[PDB]
Amino acid sequence: QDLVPAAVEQAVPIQPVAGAALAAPAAGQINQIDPWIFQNFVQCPLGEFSISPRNTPGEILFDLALGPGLNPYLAHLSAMYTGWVGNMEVQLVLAGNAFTAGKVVVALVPPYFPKGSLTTAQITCFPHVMCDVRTLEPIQLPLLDVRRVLWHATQDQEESMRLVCMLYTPLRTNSPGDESFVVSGRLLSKPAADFNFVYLTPPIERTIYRMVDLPVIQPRLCTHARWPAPVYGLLVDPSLPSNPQWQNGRVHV
Amino acid sequence: QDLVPAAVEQAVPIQPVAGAALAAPAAGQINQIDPWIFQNFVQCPLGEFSISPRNTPGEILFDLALGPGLNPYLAHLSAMYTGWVGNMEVQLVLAGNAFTAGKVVVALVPPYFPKGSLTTAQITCFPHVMCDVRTLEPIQLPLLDVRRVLWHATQDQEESMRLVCMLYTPLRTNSPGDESFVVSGRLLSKPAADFNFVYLTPPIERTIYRMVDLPVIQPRLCTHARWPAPVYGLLVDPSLPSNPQWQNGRVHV
Amino acid sequence: EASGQDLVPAAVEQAVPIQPVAGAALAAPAAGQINQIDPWIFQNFVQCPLGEFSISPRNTPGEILFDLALGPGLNPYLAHLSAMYTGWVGNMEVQLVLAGNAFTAGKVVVALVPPYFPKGSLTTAQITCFPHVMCDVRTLEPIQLPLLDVRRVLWHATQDQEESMRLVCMLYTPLRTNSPGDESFVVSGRLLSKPAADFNFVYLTPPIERTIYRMVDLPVIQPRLCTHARWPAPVYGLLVDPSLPSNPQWQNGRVHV
Amino acid sequence: EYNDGLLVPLAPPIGPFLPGEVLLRFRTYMRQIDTADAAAEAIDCALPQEFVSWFASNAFTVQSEALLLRYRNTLTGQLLFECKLYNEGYIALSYSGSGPLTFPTDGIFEVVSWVPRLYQLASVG
């Protein structure tokens, strides 16, 4: 005889990847990190997204990426080292009342996957864990380090195991006022059991993985960008052309 | 003394059926499959259905069927082999807010059952597991392989243990805007512990179990089917006869 | 056995000077998933996609006959499993069936050219400097020979990107026949191949539709029913004709493969 | 007429649609000779010939009862509608209004999955 239950936890399964056990020979040093970073989740840089009744099923909502730029400690220790190798763990938190139905699926896309279009029936063939937009408590996933080069290099922006999240079943509320009920969601992430940077280096303080800060100056004192006169006021207007092609005052981030 | 509780898990019970232990003698080979297919659910081909306030209690919602055409890996390995024998496991996911009440029952109809009308009181006498349209997490079932021929044959479309799902208690929402709140639902499926194809064979690439793909061409460039002139535009119209009997341009799938 | 032995039966894998090469034992701790390929693929040889070639007496010495690169595109299986997984490793074993009539001559050379070698000329002077094997175009049995995987990254990706140990041969000394009448025996070749002891795929991804190793499917409809591409009229018969100009530049019905 | 006035075996009329569905129509215009006006006669097929020469030369096997096609725009990737191709050779679409509604003609058709008869399509318009 036997008995197979009809409701089980999700529990994405893994097969561990080696961290600083492949890249110890061919790397100069292997640097530990403050072992109380491993112990609490913390909001990523990219940790903010929003579902909404205007999101057709298929729209990729947040596309994370393994690396030290997911945890503002590693994004800050990663200016003292020249490379990182190991795993991580991600956690997402949704926020919906009992009026919103619809599921999202988060899937650990591996590296070297052709970054194109993933239709809904194609996102779930990966390892994934399906959670719907009412759930209360956080839900977490192991972001492994499927790779082929021994240890990645921070200032290089290598290619590594992503984490994609598709709106599986269309989000739709019952019919009180809809269309204006963005279900916000946040992310967080912590180094896994086997993460450690790979060579010491002077903190160059001009590196990737540093959160942009805009100059703390009121827009009254600023100097305008198309006429030598102070900025006199900021405003929005849908009447004037909403797609101008000015030349000056045009810089990327 | 004793104590009998008043809320227990569902847990459809089984008595295992032999997979590749009956059909090893009378079959040429017995082929394993990539043992990381057994480890994650994945959306079936037929994995999409929808409940809605216009579904009287009794309407069969999704009628699956054991076979390699429930898991787009097996539906893709099954072009290299000539037969399959073993069990599988199915999981369904519903999506309802706290405004929709009503239960569905999924039942493992055996083979050689006269495919006719199943009234609600007749679907539950099978092994089943009753779940209602609010439930959050997935709910799964073991799809066994009750059979009488040793090993089925892929290109034959044998008869095997189905899986039916009837709207037990009529779905009805409270009275915000109803009648337009389709509760969508998805399916997924993974090979069970004892599934393995049965004879190797050149991948014929013209076989059953291959997902239809429509030609990627805009309907402007296409050639019309009732006059030698390019297709000039697609539209819907309820005024013109909605049941024409044209002869040309009439092909099945 | 056949009858008889005025042929030359090379049944032995000739000794190539190249060390063994580790396969999926350098990708086990860096591909977070267990994978194996059906153990009945390792048993019988089977023709590659590119399987056929011909050594006709007109082929001068130096014309590369078959230049096939190590990868999943060397079986009908390993090229049809490699639409699920993303990446491979490991060795391979390639046969070579060239059993020309007993009235022929001339020899070919097969050279395990390593990665990162500039594709292109590869003239008949620098095909022997590689670790090579010389075999006669009369050889009866199949001539096994390995195709190791020399690489500097753990496991290659399954997109055509990577560079792997090609296995190119070359018509070393030309095929010339000996029978006393009005015929030269074009020796046709075949190419069978099976994954080695530890070939293996790594990570399991969805079997995308427009993958890279779709062989080709030509539509199964008679030319009698098809439509012409230069006049709105059906096709009424196909034929060959040398009389008409044999190099036109019609600007209709002209698509690449 | 196919006989003089007698009957003739012919394909059944396109159906049946669920409550609230209509038939998508691939409409083209023809060479009309008349002196009434410039209302070019419009004839509408159920599938473009590029589909008939596709299903008849590929020979799939229908899984359950209908495919679920999404009419993704070619470049922006937005669902213009969500139609249901019944396997008997027509493309139903859950319309509600009373006047004709013309869609853009540069959308790439794409399947998402098989689906039974009872699937309640998301309404358009």
From Swiss-Prot, chain C:
- Key words of the record: Host cytoplasm, Virion
Q: Which residues form the signal peptide?
A: none
> Superkingdom, according to UniProt?
Viruses
Annotated spans, P1 sub-domain 1? 211-257
One GO CC term, this protein: virion component
Region named Shell domain: 1-210
Q: Which residues cross the membrane?
A: none
What does the UniProt entry say about where the protein is found? Virion; Host cytoplasm
Q: How does it assemble?
A: Homodimer. Homomultimer. Interacts with the minor capsid protein VP2. Interacts (via P2 subdomain) with host receptor CD300LF (via N-terminus); this interaction requires Mg(2+) and Ca(2+), and allows viral binding and entry into the host cell. Stochioimetry is 2:2. Bile acids interact with the P domain dimer interface and act as cofactors enhancing virus binding and infectivity. Interacts with host receptor CD300LD; this interaction allows viral binding and entry into the host cell.
Which family, according to the similarity comment?
Belongs to the caliciviridae capsid protein family.
Q: What is known of its domains?
A: The shell domain (S domain) contains elements essential for the formation of the icosahedron. The Protruding domain (P domain) is divided into sub-domains P1 and P2. P domain interacts in dimeric contacts that increase the stability of the capsid and form the protrusions on the virion. An hypervariable region in P2 is thought to play an important role in receptor binding and immune reactivity.
Its biological function? Answer: Capsid protein self assembles to form an icosahedral capsid with a T=3 symmetry, about 38 nm in diameter, and consisting of 180 capsid proteins. A smaller form of capsid with a diameter of 23 nm might be capsid proteins assembled as icosahedron with T=1 symmetry. The capsid encapsulates the genomic RNA and is decorated with VP2 proteins. Mediates virion attachment to the host cell receptor CD300LF.
The protein's name in its UniProt record: Capsid protein VP1
Tell me the organism: Norovirus (isolate Mouse/NoV/United States/MNV1/2002/GV)
Q: Covered range within the whole protein?
A: 15 to 271 of 541
